[PDB]
Symmetry: C3
Subunit: 298 residues, 3 copies
């Protein structure tokens, strides 16, 4: 939020990122309401907006563009993260017979062009390959990503949901450094803390971005009563809500996780940055971890 | 078949490899009938024959030998892949009490000597360690494999069913490059596409060989209705049977998979190269992948 | 362990190690009894004693201390392995709210001071981080472990229960080589032989230490009757007990496993080196492995 994180020389994000994956599903997709969402973020020092070609059935970037095209200079205040690689039978890909992945140079280039056109800008700050593609030609995808960096259309490149072997294979075909891996991380999604996925990034000194950093709402919806009670106690102790403590749990990790919080609620945007005020000591981090997992550490 | 693949400077195979593991299950195991199978393969440009010490209860190599010895000049037309490391209590290994692995210098050397005598040749083109041995002394095995290449008895060495860490360990003890990993891959066996086994080989630029490329029979059993519908549809569309589409699904992967097709059926040998006639686009590869894993891609 | 194993230029262990995890469970924790246990080990050339700060609720090192202080120069006859990183609410950490890990320089330094004071020595031979810590700051932990070696308080450093990726992350932050990884390995815990954990150490030429080589007793529980029957049959053939054959199974592996046997029974301590007299041929190793996995090898 106020804290800023250098993914590289050429890219600095806000430590908390605003996720736009539901921006299209709001009743109000007016340029004024989109500007309002972005301004509420910027008021908390949240400058990084997370997009993808696929969001809102390939319309979410165009809804954001409504905002930026209407408000000159708003784009220069934000970092835009987008993604490509999923072809789902929706919007401009509604003729697809099956959901599939496409990491071809041709598809990456047309997805970036559509991103630039829909959002009304000549560059994005970060492009991620959205999913690991079991049919990837790493030589073709890596050259495509390197060419987009060399063109200035993309400031930096990364991946999402990649396993270490997928990250290694694509990195082995590239001159540019992949600057992040956007992966699912929360109190409810802790497998990467122990299974090698996070250790791999830490050793590479790569910050992950965490999607569904609250566990997609499942924290609050009745299967994590113990974890909830602890989050509410700590929240009452430090004057913040359970949500702020759950995000602070991610921020405490030395891998320097960048949480992506994707919400249409202007109330929950306004408190988004409260996690930076939480103090999360080692013992409290293990308390929350062992409540969520339902077993003491070995 | 038509197409050839360089595993190294020293070894080139046919892109489709004839699997001889059932050679001893045929009612007829006569020299003439073996020459007939080989000649049926050579007619298609399928020059590579896949053997193992253990095939046919340690008799398959002797049956191939019947053919090669009766026709002196046939061997110069083919590449012979053989394997060792499994000791089953069968044939010349009747005295073993338990099925076990043996990767000792002495066992490898005696296995190769028997392959050379049984097939009536002074060399094999490719020797594989048949299974990863939980009791492997990598230094001893690696030294023995390097010596066999230096002697000219074996043109190149590879492994079979190795995990990446098994491959890494053995390669660390050897001067010669392991040229392949022969692993199960098919629309019924897709784990290597996502679990790091194939990414490892793709990053190292090692072509896998794929055994049971049709599920060793189970794909056509009618348990996989959705998958066979698409294979049969695509086959009808391109004038080939379902089995040629299922092999073409492997050939479409950019890791340059080398399928091994095992059959005694002269008609199925005559049509074995039809897989190379199939054109399969990315979307169709994912249609079949999707049908095979029984759910949408993430 | 007449046989000795160099883990480094500065550290040699006995091939069999006496684990003291149970030393606080004995009704008798008197100095004379502790000396009797050490003396029974030394009579057989077992010189290495395995400790941890946490054993006996943070009292086992003090119990060993009682024996060593009572017998000047006994400490110069042995190697002491200890560990830190686990904070359970017991003994001097009874103030802890929850079982957690602590790999901070502060905790490591205080734990090592408590080890040296309780055991009455100015150094330990080997210090292990006891468990992989999801909150590890590898830079901080690594500098702390290197500082301890440079001070002379620790001759060598290692880890315990680390996955290969945890081992790799910590090693990347250190100048000294981690000299071992103390992992569970037994005829009832065989996953590391196939899952990449042993292969990683074998490729790095790092001897693992094996803890619970008898499953902490579970091997004799009744759920492993087939394994036990074979162990007693082999034991009777060679004039040793089931324990000796189960440990000889670990000793047979080419990765030079160092088994850690924890018992308070003076007659079992007195035969602990019998494992080194067992002849364990490849077929017998695979007989016992086949019993461990419950099916023939693939």
């Amino acid at each position: 939020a106020m804290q800023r994180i250098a993914l590289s020389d050429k890219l600095e994000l806000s430590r908390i990122v605003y996720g736009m994956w539901r921006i299209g599903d709001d009743a109000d997709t007016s340029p004024a309401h989109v500007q309002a969402k972005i301004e509420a973020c910027l008021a908390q020092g949240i400058t990084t907006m997370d997009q993808a070609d696929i969001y809102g059935g390939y319309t979410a970037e165009a809804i954001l563009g409504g905002g930026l095209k209407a408000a000159p200079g708003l784009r220069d205040k934000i970092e835009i993260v987008t993604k490509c690689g999923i072809v789902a039978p929706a919007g401009r890909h509604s003729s697809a017979r099956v959901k599939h992945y496409d990491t071809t140079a041709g598809h990456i280039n047309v997805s970036v062009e559509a991103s630039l056109r829909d959002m009304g800008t000549d560059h994005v700050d970060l492009l991620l390959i959205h999913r690991p593609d079991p049919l990837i030609d790493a030589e073709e995808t890596g050259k495509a990503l390197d060419a987009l960096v060399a063109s200035g259309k993309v400031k930096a490149v990364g991946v999402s949901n990649f396993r270490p072997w997928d990250f290694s294979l694509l990195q082995s075909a590239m001159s540019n450094r992949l600057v992040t891996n956007q992966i699912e991380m929360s109190l409810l999604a802790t497998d990467t803390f122990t299974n090698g996925d996070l250790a791999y990034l830490q050793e590479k000194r790569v910050s992950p971005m965490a999607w569904s950093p609250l566990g997609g709402g499942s924290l609050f919806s009745g299967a994590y009563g113990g974890t909830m009670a602890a989050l509410q106690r700590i929240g009452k102790e430090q004057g913040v809500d359970a949500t702020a403590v759950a995000i602070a749990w991610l921020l405490r990790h030395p891998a320097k996780i960048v949480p992506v919080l994707g919400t249409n609620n202007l109330e929950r945007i306004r408190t988004a940055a409260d996690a930076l005020r939480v103090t999360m000591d080692r013992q409290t981090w293990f308390e929350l971890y062992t409540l969520a997992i339902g077993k003491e550490v070995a």
